[PDB]
């Protein structure tokens, strides 16, 4: 019943999808069964920034930043599975959390 839960967070959904694909392929190689990847709801934060130095309240830039989240479940681990996951390299821009 040793279940491994992996949560991926990023600011770039292509990067996060690449990482999720790499992880699921690495696990399927060692032969443990996988569940996911499951996409969690995205968070969106918006900002309004005045562009003129002194006075134009109607002249503004609207920016945003998104946080993408992916969930991966590992069931029936093989001994090689955890070692392969730990030897997996850390891609820049993607945050990975592993819970047992």
């Amino acid at each position: 019943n040793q279940r491994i839960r992996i949560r991926l967070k990023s600011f770039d959904h292509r990067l996060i999808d690449q990482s999720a694909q790499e992880i699921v392929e690495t696990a399927k190689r060692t032969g443990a069964q996988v569940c996911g990847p499951i996409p969690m709801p995205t968070r969106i934060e918006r900002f309004n920034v005045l562009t003129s130095p002194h006075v134009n309240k109607d002249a503004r830039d609207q920016y945003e930043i998104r946080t993408y989240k992916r969930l991966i479940d590992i069931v029936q681990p093989t001994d090689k599975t955890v070692d392969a996951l730990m030897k997996l390299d850390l891609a820049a821009g993607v945050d990975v959390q592993i819970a047992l």
């Binding site: 309004n48 109607d58 503004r60 609207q62």
Partner: protein, 126 residues
């Protein structure tokens, strides 16, 4: 037996249509308990009334999101799709009635510098 999905202004309706004798239930409630204003009930009942078939089917309906008008419209759309999924030849009559179309109108966003989607603050030359 047959299934239909309806959508109208952020409302979504799941409709299960079978053969029987006219029971109707929405979110484990009757039509009169669920909808208080009678025009919503007429909107819900329009498809079967237009077919003269209100005593030959059982309807099991779940609905979520939106307001009363949106939910009534979604339920009507779902009933139409469920009837079409039961008898294909019925579609011309429902399309003539106008029940097959998915209404796409939705709330417009507020815009920078305006009070609303279109309303503009009061202007003065002097």
């Amino acid at each position: 037996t047959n299934y239909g999905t309806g959508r109208r202004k952020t409302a979504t309706a799941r409709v299960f249509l079978s053969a029987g004798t006219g029971k109707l239930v929405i979110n484990n409630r009757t039509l009169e308990q669920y909808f208080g204003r009678e025009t919503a009930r007429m909107v819900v009942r329009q498809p079967l009334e237009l077919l003269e078939a209100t005593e030959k089917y059982d309807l099991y309906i779940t609905v979520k999101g939106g307001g009363i008008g949106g939910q009534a419209g979604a339920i009507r759309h779902g009933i139409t799709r469920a009837l079409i999924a039961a008898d294909e030849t019925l579609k011309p009559v429902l399309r003539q009635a106008g029940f097959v179309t998915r209404d796409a109108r939705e709330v417009e966003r507020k815009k920078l510098g305006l009070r609303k989607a279109r309303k503009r603050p009061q202007f003065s030359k002097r």
